[PDB]
From Swiss-Prot:
Organism: Amycolatopsis orientalis
Pathway involvement of the protein, from the record: Antibiotic biosynthesis; vancomycin biosynthesis
Family membership: Belongs to the cytochrome P450 family.
A single BP term in Gene Ontology: vancomycin biosynthetic process
PROSITE patterns, sorted: CYTOCHROME_P450 (PS00086)
Protein name: Cytochrome P450 165B3
Keyword Heme included in the entry's annotation: yes
Keywords, in A-Z order: Heme, Iron, Metal-binding, Monooxygenase, Oxidoreductase
Swiss-Prot/TrEMBL cofactor(s): heme
Binding positions for heme per the UniProt entry: C326
Annotated GO MF terms: heme binding; iron ion binding; monooxygenase activity; oxidoreductase activity, acting on paired donors, with incorporation or reduction of molecular oxygen
UniProt key word Metal-binding: yes
Entry-linked CDD domains: CYP105-like
Species lineage: Bacteria, Bacillati, Actinomycetota, Actinomycetes, Pseudonocardiales
Length: 377
């Protein structure tokens, strides 16, 4: 394997080499004139210390509205400004909408008949539709909006195409923001402007939309796909999605902890010299935290390496830690819970279409996941 240790998985787990590295050690990513050195933190307490001490570890190093690029006090102000579109009450209001979105996708899969690819019908479609509903993109515009969203970032396209889709995407978003300023709706944009008005600038809001579209897509499709695969491999646990809501929420939390789809959060930069876990960190050093390794730290529980949806909950760092803790965490838990509950309500006998087949993992994104999952029912 020529890939960095923090990118390695073995099935649903961290790779053994990644798990056996030190709590904090040096690594070099890349070669020749590209090669760089970083510290990699794999221990739960070290990742919490690094991520939680923003006075000591900065996330900077332009993109307006990208919260991850700022440090307090600038971060604090921007995050406060976007928070109205993510309150727990706004999430409760979204639930009916997310249930309809999931059922519409399940309907298409049902119509296609067994066996069918759960990744193409559900995992890769729900995330985007849910974000469109959150942002406030009108139904009939979603398909078009999503091609612009993905398109303006497709490295495979020429400068001329990417640029054209990008100019089209900004124009769509800016037009949406101006519409919302006039008559604020319940979407994210409308919630922010209703509270801040002109203080939330056009560029801030446009940038917020781009970043949210990015932050809540890959992590969720990876969790939908790896989550169904994990449950089908532990069938006695599926009942956690066939009971009350508490039961399902606890199963979703355990799956997020067990699978930790993001390999690492934004790299942290030491803003000064310090000693951490016995190592001497110097002003300017870069630190990469392995969230998957941290959520498999042995001190967390004697059976931390197993999936147990009924265990005593283990606080995890899959949504990060500190001021940058996932702003979309509540929506993510709700979305995943809705997907898994409606899935097993509709397909009680869901199973792998071919139990012998090798698993097709998605190894090219910032989040682990599946590229295809054939299921039958
Ligand atoms: C299973 C799903 C998800 C996982 C595991 C997850 C994970 C993360 C992590 C680890 C961070 C912290 C990054 C850092 O400290 O550098 C974070 C940040 C963030 N996430 Fe999520 N996320 C998920 C879903 C979502 C969704 C559904 C939304 C969008 C509606 C969202 C929006 C964001 C935003 C805006 C930030 C930046 C917060 C800030 O910098 O203050 N995430 N997420």
């Amino acid at each position: 394997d020529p890939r960095p240790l923090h990118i390695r998985r073995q099935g649903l787990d961290p790779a053994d080499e990644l798990l056996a590295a030190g709590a904090l050690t040096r690594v070099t990513i890349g070669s020749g004139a590209d090669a760089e050195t970083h510290w990699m933190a794999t221990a739960h307490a070290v990742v919490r210390q690094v991520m939680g001490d923003h006075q000591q570890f900065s996330t900077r190093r332009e993109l307006v509205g990208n919260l991850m690029d700022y440090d307090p006090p600038e971060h604090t102000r921007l995050r406060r400004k976007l928070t109205p579109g993510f309150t727990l009450r706004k999430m409760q209001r979204m639930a009916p909408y997310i249930e309809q979105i999931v059922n519409d996708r399940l309907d298409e899969m049902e119509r296609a008949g067994s066996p069918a690819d759960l990744i193409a019908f559900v995992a890769d479609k729900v995330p985007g539709a849910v974000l469109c509903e959150l942002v406030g993109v009108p139904r009939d515009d979603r398909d078009m909006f999503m091609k612009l969203c993905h398109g303006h970032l497709d490295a495979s396209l020429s400068q001329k195409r990417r640029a054209a889709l990008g100019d089209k995407f900004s124009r769509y978003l800016l037009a949406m923001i101006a519409r919302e300023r006039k008559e604020p709706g319940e979407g994210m944009i409308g919630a922010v402007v209703a509270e801040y008005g002109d203080d939330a600038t056009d560029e801030e809001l446009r940038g917020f939309c781009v970043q949210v579209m990015l932050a809540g897509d890959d992590n969720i499709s990876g969790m939908i796909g790896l989550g169904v695969l994990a449950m089908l491999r532990h069938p006695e646990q599926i009942d956690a999605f066939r009971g009350d809501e508490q039961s399902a929420q606890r199963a979703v939390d355990e799956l997020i902890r067990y699978l930790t789809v993001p390999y690492s959060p934004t790299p942290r930069i030491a803003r000064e010299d310090l000693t951490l876990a016995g190592q001497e960190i110097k002003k300017g050093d870069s630190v990469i935290c392995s969230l998957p390794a941290a959520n498999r730290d042995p001190a967390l529980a004697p059976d931390v390496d197993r999936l147990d949806v009924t265990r005593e909950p283990i606080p995890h760092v899959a949504f990060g830690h500190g001021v940058h803790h996932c702003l979309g965490a509540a929506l993510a838990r709700l979305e995943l819970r809705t997907v898994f509950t409606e899935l097993w309500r509709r397909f009680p006998a869901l199973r792998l279409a071919d139990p012998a087949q090798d698993t097709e993992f998605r190894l090219t994104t910032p989040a682990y996941g599946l590229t295809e999952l054939m299921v039958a029912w």
